[PDB]
RNA sequence: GGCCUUGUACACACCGCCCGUCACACCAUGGGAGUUUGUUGCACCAGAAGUAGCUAGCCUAACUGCAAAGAGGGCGGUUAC
């Protein structure tokens, strides 16, 4: 709430009301809507959350994964309608908010310990 | 000019035989700044399926228990090769 009240009021009418709770270090599956011509489908993007920005309507989160030996990161905009659904598959145990150090690790070294209730 | 003997790689028989460089044509081959293929010795990194060990997170038909739940099993995690 660092913006003017009118801007806050305009942003508040667009907020999603069903996002789950998730934190950096988790692994999530994001369903993205893909539109080809008139063909609508859902595509899954599964990976580790390495960064999360909490800014209301301007909230975002970064997901990193390995695809056919190539690392790929996508910075999803949380409240965009393109993100159909977010599932939390596993909860991780980390010590910091941003996990950019995972970019320099591979395979076993990049494993994240599971957070145990 | 004639006879005997001797040496010879000459026998078309010394107008013999025959050697090497240079020039010409062909053939195989050695060396050579480098270029490139296969294979291999170490040293390290990464590492699947699989097997062996340890775990206690989760889930559970046959057994035990009046039942609560145990035993056993499975998934997961993890170490070695």
From Swiss-Prot:
Ribonucleoprotein listed as a keyword: yes
SUPFAM superfamilies: Translation proteins SH3-like domain
Naturally occurring in which organism (per UniProt): Acinetobacter baumannii (strain AB0057)
Keyword annotations: Ribonucleoprotein, Ribosomal protein
Pfam families (UniProt xref): Ribosomal_L19
Protein name per Swiss-Prot or TrEMBL: Large ribosomal subunit protein bL19
Gene name tied to this protein: rplS
Function (record text): This protein is located at the 30S-50S ribosomal subunit interface and may play a role in the structure and function of the aminoacyl-tRNA binding site.
Domain of life: Bacteria
GO terms for biological process, alphabetical: translation
One GO CC term on file: cytosolic large ribosomal subunit
NCBIfam families: rplS_bact
Keyword Zinc attached: no
GO MF term list: structural constituent of ribosome
HAMAP family named in the record: Ribosomal_bL19
InterPro entries listed in its UniProt record: Ribosomal_bL19 (IPR001857), Ribosomal_bL19_CS (IPR018257), Ribosomal_bL19_sf (IPR038657), Translation_prot_SH3-like_sf (IPR008991)
Similarity annotation: Belongs to the bacterial ribosomal protein bL19 family.
């Amino acid at each position: 709430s660092g913006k003017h009240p009118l801007v806050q009021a305009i942003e508040n009418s667009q907020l999603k009301t069903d996002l789950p709770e998730f934190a950096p270090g988790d692994t999530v599956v994001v369903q993205v809507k893909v539109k080809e011509g008139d063909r609508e489908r859902l595509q899954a993007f599964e990976g580790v959350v390495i960064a999360k920005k909490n800014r209301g309507l301007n909230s975002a989160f970064t997901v990193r994964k390995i695809s056919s030996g190539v690392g790929v990161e996508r910075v999803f905009q949380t409240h965009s309608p393109v993100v159909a659904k977010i599932e939390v598959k596993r909860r991780g145990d980390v010590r910091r908010a941003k996990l950019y150090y995972l970019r320099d690790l591979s395979g076993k070294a990049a494993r994240i310990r599971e957070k145990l209730p």
